[PDB]
Design a protein around this ligand. Structure first.
Ligand SMILES: [Ca+2]
Ligand SMILES: [Ca+2]
Length: 77
């Protein structure tokens, strides 16, 4: 089972296969109500290649380290 898949469809509001400051924010703003000011900082560490976008691979690379989040995000997202 790939829970990150179904959830990946949310974070990827652009439906292009990556998460930017416009898409990511949509998540942290829906579950946290934050802004891009923190997004660029959150993805900056998640980005395994750092290209201004968060792919699917890196998405799990970092998310995996956050077992307490994947449980909350997979509850609504
Ligand atoms: Ca996208
Ligand atoms: Ca990337």
């Amino acid at each position: 089972a790939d829970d990150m898949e179904r959830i990946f469809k949310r974070f990827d509001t652009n439906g292009d296969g990556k998460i930017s400051l416009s898409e990511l924010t949509d998540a942290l703003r829906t579950l946290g109500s934050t802004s891009a000011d923190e997004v660029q900082r959150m993805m900056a560490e998640i980005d395994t290649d750092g290209d201004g976008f968060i792919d699917f691979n890196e998405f799990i690379s970092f998310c995996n380290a956050n077992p307490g989040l994947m449980k909350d995000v997979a509850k609504v997202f």
